[PDB]
Design an enzyme around this catalytic site. Sequence first.
Site, PDB file in Angstrom:
ATOM      1  N   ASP A 703    -117.740 -65.286-124.180  1.00 40.73           N
ATOM      2  CA  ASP A 703    -117.918 -66.698-123.956  1.00 40.73           C
ATOM      3  C   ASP A 703    -117.823 -66.921-122.424  1.00 40.73           C
ATOM      4  O   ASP A 703    -117.350 -66.055-121.687  1.00 40.73           O
ATOM      5  CB  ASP A 703    -116.893 -67.509-124.760  1.00 40.73           C
TER       6      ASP A 703
HETATM    7  O1  LIG Z   1    -120.075 -72.236-127.172  1.00 34.69           O
HETATM    8  C1  LIG Z   1    -120.000 -71.833-125.799  1.00 34.69           C
HETATM    9  C2  LIG Z   1    -118.921 -72.635-125.059  1.00 34.69           C
HETATM   10  O2  LIG Z   1    -117.644 -72.308-125.650  1.00 34.69           O
HETATM   11  C3  LIG Z   1    -118.984 -72.417-123.515  1.00 34.69           C
HETATM   12  O3  LIG Z   1    -118.152 -73.320-122.776  1.00 34.69           O
HETATM   13  O4  LIG Z   1    -120.321 -72.571-123.004  1.00 34.69           O
HETATM   14  C4  LIG Z   1    -121.247 -71.681-123.635  1.00 34.69           C
HETATM   15  C5  LIG Z   1    -121.350 -72.020-125.121  1.00 34.69           C
HETATM   16  O5  LIG Z   1    -122.334 -71.206-125.761  1.00 34.69           O
END
Ligand SMILES: O[C@@H]1[C@@H](O)[C@H](O)OC[C@H]1O
Length: 792
Positions: A703
């Site tokens: 992430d």
């Molecule tokens: O879900 C994800 C989120 O948690 C992040 O902040 O930005 C990218 C996204 O895909």
Amino acid sequence: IEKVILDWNEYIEAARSVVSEGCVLLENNGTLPLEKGAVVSIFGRIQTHYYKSGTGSGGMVNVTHVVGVPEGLKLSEHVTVNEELENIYKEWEEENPFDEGTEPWSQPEMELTDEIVSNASAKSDVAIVIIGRTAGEDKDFSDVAGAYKLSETEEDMLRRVRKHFDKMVVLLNVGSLMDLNVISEINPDALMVIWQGGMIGGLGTADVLTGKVNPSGKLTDTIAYEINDYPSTENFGDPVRDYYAEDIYVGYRYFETFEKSKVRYPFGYGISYTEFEHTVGEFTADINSRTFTASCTVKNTGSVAGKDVAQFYVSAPQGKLGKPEKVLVAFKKTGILNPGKEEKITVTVPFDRFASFDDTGVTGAESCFVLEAGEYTVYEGKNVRESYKEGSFTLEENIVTEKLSKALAPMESFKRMKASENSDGTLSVKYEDVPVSDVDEKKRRLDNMPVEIPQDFTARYSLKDVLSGSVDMEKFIARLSDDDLACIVRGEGMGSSLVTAGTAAAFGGVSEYLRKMDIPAVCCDDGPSGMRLDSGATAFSMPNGTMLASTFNPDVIERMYGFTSLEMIYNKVECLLGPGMNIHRNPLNGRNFEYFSEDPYLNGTIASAMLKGLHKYGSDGVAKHFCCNNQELGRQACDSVVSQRALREIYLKGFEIAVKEGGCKAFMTTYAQVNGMWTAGNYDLNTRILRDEWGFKGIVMTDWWAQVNDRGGEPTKNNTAAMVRAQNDLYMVTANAAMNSANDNTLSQLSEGKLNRAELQRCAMNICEYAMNTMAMKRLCRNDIKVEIAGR
Ligand SMILES: O[C@@H]1[C@@H](O)[C@H](O)OC[C@H]1O
């Protein structure tokens, strides 16, 4: 080489069909559908600012226009809207503008007078009241007025409208469900959840309101009378740590087994403008193939045409492990059935859909999926509660459906719920100790270490030569220097200039040296509900995840995302950052709007429909967040403490289906911890379970700016050696990958022998194998699909 037309009007139509299949009619005395020529008064200030999505990464799709509910009704040409009342709201709103924030859960409601409400009633046939809620990333939903509960002025509005109109329709323009106790008590004539339907939501909603389409949506969660009735509420909302004590007893797995009377609306519930009769049919079992086959007939016994959903459930014998009373194993939505017509529905159900994971060894098969000895009863019906006996079969001995391993087990003990059989033949909740992990993680990593490929910088093969079949991937990867290896595991972003402006990331060809090998720059972009382009460029805003899931119709979902497949190619986006498919563990989780269900089978099946859609023209999705990101509060550090069984049957299961049914080839890990370390560096998650057990062949990415750690160590945003040791292949993201802008530890750890070159090569091979099958590789090879948009 080849040109394809993206017809925008058909894209609109496909999305519109999803909206009209995903609205969930909960109550109706016949006030719906609205009568031809009727005049409607629309209450609720949010009518002017239709919630098309939730907030965050998955709710920043730019559009030129949003069709709200008032506009959708006017365009129908079936009713008219009271224009005087609209102008009261419009004029009031110039003094009380929509708050944009950080963005609040709801907007302050306009106070109504006896005069306004009374005059609207004199000049209209029916009241429509719209209650609006949004929610999303980092902000959990809360059990307070203005959030899960009605606000005081919203309640006033509803009571006034009830008093002055004998025809009253309530619509919930909500990302996730809210309290229905006060609404039910006020007792409108009709109640419908309309979710958040993207930029054309009002068109599809008008279709169901006017009866052009007959509502056929079903709940993907159980609605209980109180937040405290939910089995996870006791252990939800703590920023540091939450124990998943409910274990496998999530949602209807808890309620149908232990607490039937706490349910207002059961899982799979939803009604229509017609009525249906479900007649159980032939039942056969094939123990050697590990399947059963079940038939039933659904008949429209009312006076208008419509669809229904046949839902199939299995009751497994309690045995030593304990079981939910019923688990969903199959479903099928009918075609449109005319009055008095019928459809025969047959399903074949593999035993793995109702297997149990033995994490204690009480079945004699620890670390396996098993069917315990006893009677298996199959049920069919309209929802989990109204499901009736379809057939049965009895196993005299245990069947091991699959041999697995002790993986991702909890590192500390806690008490979990246990199904306990009383003297009455009823089931009660008791508690038992979850066994603690005895896995030697150091040894597991060392015993399964991949083999190093000797580097060779003279022999210079292209990634094209691997794609063509001319050389092994191993033969190609030998030319990557340690610099190249350190570089290829870094995603660049946000807004890297190697790919379309305003997207999330570039990966693969993130240096000049990597690009020279014909590794392309592959583009990632949010999100499940449509492309987020931070340049301001517009794109299709589609309905939210929960609305998709409420269709119970994989085909209509797949059809829509087939259009998204082409739109992505048009925008040169290879990887859409969806589906979001974390389980609805608690109704108060902020991001429930972009997820699907409390049920893993539905969750995986809906996720897989989206992925098949995106795969139509060679685009792709990234399943997220792997796994157990079921809470927004504390998500940078929170520790989900959860049993192996709960992981295997509930939280991982959806993702497993995404891999095996959906063909998923890209996963995103989480910001948080599962069983005492961060997910981005967890070997058991990303290697043992995902690759070695499920057979996943693809990439895992972090992430965005997620923390990584070694177990027991301190979390950081640049411990990429821990990341690569787990086979999380890509750190998302860095400002400049070639320059190591994050000052990561890949090379120093390789220098010190704490990271093996073979581990880097494994990650680089995953990245290159993924990258060579993308549309970005096709652009280098000059055999890409060219897309042209028609109908604008
Ligand atoms: O879900 C994800 C989120 O948690 C992040 O902040 O930005 C990218 C996204 O895909």
